[PDB]
Design an enzyme around this catalytic site. Sequence first.
Site, PDB file in Angstrom:
ATOM      1  N   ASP A 194       0.856  -1.177   0.000  1.00 40.48           N
ATOM      2  CA  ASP A 194       0.000   0.000   0.000  1.00 40.48           C
ATOM      3  C   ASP A 194       0.896   1.232   0.000  1.00 40.48           C
ATOM      4  OD1 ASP A 194       0.850   0.453   2.685  1.00 40.48           O
ATOM      5  OD2 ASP A 194      -1.129   1.194   3.244  1.00 40.48           O
ATOM      6  N   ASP A 196       1.308   5.053   1.927  1.00 44.15           N
ATOM      7  CA  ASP A 196       0.952   5.771   3.145  1.00 44.15           C
ATOM      8  C   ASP A 196       1.347   7.233   2.996  1.00 44.15           C
ATOM      9  OD1 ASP A 196       0.204   3.361   4.926  1.00 44.15           O
ATOM     10  OD2 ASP A 196       2.231   2.847   4.258  1.00 44.15           O
ATOM     11  N   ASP A 251      -3.411   4.808   2.380  1.00 44.29           N
ATOM     12  CA  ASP A 251      -3.772   5.314   3.696  1.00 44.29           C
ATOM     13  C   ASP A 251      -3.455   6.800   3.751  1.00 44.29           C
ATOM     14  OD1 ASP A 251      -4.662   2.845   4.647  1.00 44.29           O
ATOM     15  OD2 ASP A 251      -2.667   2.299   5.378  1.00 44.29           O
TER      16      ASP A 251
HETATM   17 MN   LIG Z   1      -0.770   1.475   5.132  1.00 46.47          MN
HETATM   18 MN   LIG Z   2       2.478   0.749   4.007  1.00 46.25          MN
END
Ligand SMILES: [Mn+2]
Ligand SMILES: [Mn+2]
Length: 327
Positions: A194, A196, A251
């Site tokens: 992912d 961030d 995120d």
């Molecule tokens: Mn994350």
């Molecule tokens: Mn991450």
Amino acid sequence: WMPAYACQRPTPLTHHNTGLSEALEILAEAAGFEGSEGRLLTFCRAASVLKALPSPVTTLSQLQGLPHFGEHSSRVVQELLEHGVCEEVERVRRSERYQTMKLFTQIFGVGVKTADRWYREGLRTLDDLREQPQKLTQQQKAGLQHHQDLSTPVLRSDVDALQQVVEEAVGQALPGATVTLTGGFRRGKLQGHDVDFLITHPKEGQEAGLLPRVMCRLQDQGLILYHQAFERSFCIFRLPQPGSWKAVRVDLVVAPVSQFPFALLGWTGSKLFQRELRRFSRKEKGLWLNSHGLFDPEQKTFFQAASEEDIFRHLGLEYLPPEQRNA
DNA sequence: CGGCATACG
DNA sequence: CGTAT
DNA sequence: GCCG
Ligand SMILES: [Mn+2]
Ligand SMILES: [Mn+2]
Ligand SMILES: [Mn+2]
Ligand SMILES: [Mn+2]
Ligand SMILES: [Mn+2]
Ligand SMILES: [Mn+2]
Ligand SMILES: [Mn+2]
Ligand code: NA
């Protein structure tokens, strides 16, 4: 020679004991699937110690005096050095329990407790979950629909495109607001699961209410495949691809500038590094650390930090750049 | 033997 | 319960 | 599972 806390030693992303640490991390992961957080931590710490060594471990005697290496972790290393394989590790790898818990827990929206219950109910595959979608949460439905894309590594090339996109929406939601890349990519990783981002504004208080405005503008741009006042947003982004697109977990986090150093530190990780850093702060220095600040419970005061360097100094630790926090 | 990081959604 | 480092 |  080797300090006991991971925050006391540089840990680079790449190192000289990859095979040994990977094996120990299998046992750590399996411990977590069985609810043994204590055993998980020890195996994680033992693995991180090897990551911090300056050369490969070739003989068992080289483990003497290393923190977090006792009978069990030493035996794992012993067998890997003698036979190139550890029977316990291989038994875990091919166990139905391990494979299924790993498959389930890696679904966005599914934790150990949910995966375990599903395993006890006889469920084993993703299609087993798709057959009865009435028992799934909206979050789990999103994680299951996008599971294939979310299992594909995010590349650093993908990150630059997303950041420009996020900054555009942030710039409209609040001029002057900034976006900082955190997580594994800030530690130097070339791939990740992912992306961030940490968002703030140089004028204390202006960040209030910011994240809803950012999300609304991203959604209006058609870039949000899933998202839930708030300060953390766990989303799935529609990332353009050659003649198409792919889903990517992103995120978004907001913090006031006064807290930015602590949030940057926390969200840059690694997970083990931050756990060890907070354990060190409390047990060794008597200070309470989180991603919002550092609290002295005696004077009942919060430490003012203008940088990550400030925080390391207030904990009596030598500064470690993000690339050396890969515990 | 007790502890094992600490939050937010 | 999930999520995050 | 390991440290203190
Ligand atoms: Mn994350
Ligand atoms: Mn991450
Ligand atoms: Mn044992
Ligand atoms: Mn043997
Ligand atoms: Mn907060
Ligand atoms: Mn005990
Ligand atoms: Mn992570
Ligand atoms: Na999950």
